Amino acid sequence: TSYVGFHGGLWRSVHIDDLRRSTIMASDVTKLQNVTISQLFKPE
């Protein structure tokens, strides 16, 4: 909160929460919002 933000001019403000890609969690949080924890383990 103590960081000044949306500088204009020749700058664009985008927010990347983690720089490194994770091969563990899927990168779409809504798919995780559909299912519950028991439904993560459903086999083929």
UniProtKB/Swiss-Prot annotation:
UniProt note: phenotype after gene disruption: No visible phenotype. Males and female are fertile and produce normal-sized litters. Mice do not spontaneously develop Moyamoya disease, a chronic occlusive cerebrovascular disease. Mice are however more susceptible to Rift Valley fever virus infection. Mice show elevated expression of MMP9.
Annotated localization: Cytoplasm, Cytosol; Lipid droplet
Quaternary structure and partners: Monomer. Interacts with UBE2L3/UBCH7; UBE2L3/UBCH7 is the most efficient ubiquitin-conjugating enzyme E2 for the ubiquitin ligase activity. Interacts with UBE2N/UBC13; promoting 'Lys-63'-linked ubiquitination of target proteins.
Family: Belongs to the AAA ATPase family.
Entry's free-text remark on domains: Composed of an N-terminal stalk, a dynein-like core comprised of two catalytically active and four inactive ATPase domains, and a C-terminal E3 module. The ATPase regions do not generate movement but rather act like an intricate molecular 'switch'. The RING-type zinc finger domain is required for the ubiquitin-protein ligase activity.
Protein task: Atypical E3 ubiquitin ligase that can catalyze ubiquitination of both proteins and lipids, and which is involved in various processes, such as lipid metabolism, angiogenesis and cell-autonomous immunity. Acts as a key immune sensor by catalyzing ubiquitination of the lipid A moiety of bacterial lipopolysaccharide (LPS) via its RZ-type zinc-finger: restricts the proliferation of cytosolic bacteria, such as Salmonella, by generating the bacterial ubiquitin coat through the ubiquitination of LPS.
Protein name as catalogued: E3 ubiquitin-protein ligase RNF213
Organism per entry: Mus musculus
Species lineage: Eukaryota, Metazoa, Chordata, Craniata, Vertebrata
Gene name tied to this protein: Rnf213
